[PDB]
Design a protein around this ligand. Structure first.
Ligand code: 6HW
Ligand code: CL
Ligand code: CL
Length: 371
């Protein structure tokens, strides 16, 4: 089970695609909900995500069918299409998924953020870093729900530097474009969702605290955080969850004026990666780094809750730390960081000491010795 949020708000979930093309925005929205009696949200909504996943894992597409058999009816505890809780402007997080992932796979994070009074836009990237994604060739195809699927691109070694850097830049543009979409919906612009869903986007009118905007992401998405901040000053701070820094151009490192928080797993990180994180440091910049003791790369994704302890450890989906314990640390330290750098009037400062890595399951800074 994906954990429910720890916050006081009930959580709703919906999908938004606008426009309908490969260049439009696709996001999953997590939001404080009025009601708490809807159907739970389907975690992986289409068979083709499973084909994509099994390509990314390097198995036959028929393994996709077995993954579908095992995981295809799994839900996440968010009220599908629930009405948005009224009477309050909400801060906004744009969320970027890792390589081989897609918009739905960080609901433990998205639900928890939403339960504390955030609207969360988890983008689905069309850079061919997702396992799978879909869009519509044209208006006719959108109208009859005739989906065109785009699958993960495998790179030759010669393509790595260049294609990863082209992808992190498209990712950033996709994050800004998602933000401008939500801001326009907030500023009342009528938008026709390319998905025929029973959630009126008009609910989102006057619902965003327009100055309180952050960008968060895991792995490839953690590099997207940094690229996004350097390109789009509307984002006021970012949190890179076990960022994979390789996609970033040399030019970005001196170009990040916003506060930036690195939350790392113990077992993923390596010198080349930590050196790149340290290249983001400057005495006039706000920078923080913590490491979750006992944790693996996938402790930030929902896959860490999808299996039992033994199979989980085997598939490197779980570390020595309990998954609920690890995500609570990452989500609480994130909440405190967001309160500080967005100027929120909540009680998230109760977790300020986690920003400093002051917990029995936290390492301040990094365990990684560089030079
Ligand atoms: C646990 C699980 C559930 C539903 C589909 C796939 C998996 C799975 C996932 C990984 N890891 C990944 N990390 C990023 C993308 S896929 C490994 C193994 C399995 C079975
Ligand atoms: Cl790892
Ligand atoms: Cl290294």
């Amino acid at each position: 089970k994906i954990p429910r949020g720890n916050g006081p708000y009930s959580v709703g979930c919906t999908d938004l695609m606008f426009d309908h093309t490969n260049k439009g925005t696709f996001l999953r929205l997590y939001y404080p909900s009025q009601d708490n009696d809807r159907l739970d949200t389907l975690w992986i909504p289409n068979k083709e995500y499973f084909w994509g996943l099994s390509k990314f894992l390097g198995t036959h597409w028929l393994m996709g069918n077995i993954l579908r058999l095992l995981f295809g009816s799994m839900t996440t505890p968010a009220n599908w299409n629930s009405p948005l809780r009224p009477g309050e402007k909400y801060p906004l997080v744009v969320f970027s998924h890792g390589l081989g992932a897609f918009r739905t796979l960080y609901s433990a994070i998205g639900i928890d953020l939403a339960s504390h009074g955030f609207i969360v836009a988890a983008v689905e990237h069309r850079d061919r870093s997702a396992s799978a994604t879909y869009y519509f060739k044209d208006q006719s195809a959108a109208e009859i729900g005739d989906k065109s699927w785009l699958y993960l691109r495998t790179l030759k070694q010669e393509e790595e530097t260049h294609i990863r850097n082209e992808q992190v830049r498209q990712r950033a543009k996709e994050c800004s474009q998602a933000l401008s979409l939500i801001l326009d919906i907030d500023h009342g612009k009528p938008v026709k969702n390319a998905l025929d869903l029973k959630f009126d986007m008009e609910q989102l009118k006057d619902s965003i605290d327009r100055e309180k905007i952050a960008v968060i992401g895991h792995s490839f998405g953690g590099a997207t955080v940094i690229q996004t901040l350097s390109e789009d000053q509307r984002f006021r701070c970012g949190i890179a969850l076990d960022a994979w820094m390789f996609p970033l151009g040399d030019e970005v490192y001196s170009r990040i004026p916003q506060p930036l928080f690195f939350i790392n797993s113990e077992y993923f990180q390596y010198p080349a990666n930590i050196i790149k994180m340290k290249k983001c440091y400057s005495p006039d910049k706000e920078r923080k780094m913590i490491t979750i003791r006992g944790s693996v790369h996938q402790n930030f994704a929902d896959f860490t809750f999808a299996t039992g302890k033994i199979i989980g450890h085997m598939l490197k989906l779980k570390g020595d730390i309990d998954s609920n314990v690890a995500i609570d640390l990452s989500n609480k330290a994130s909440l405190a960081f967001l309160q500080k750098h967005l100027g929120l009037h909540k009680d998230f400062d109760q977790w300020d000491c986690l920003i400093e890595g002051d917990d029995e399951n936290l390492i301040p800074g990094t365990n990684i010795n560089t030079t």
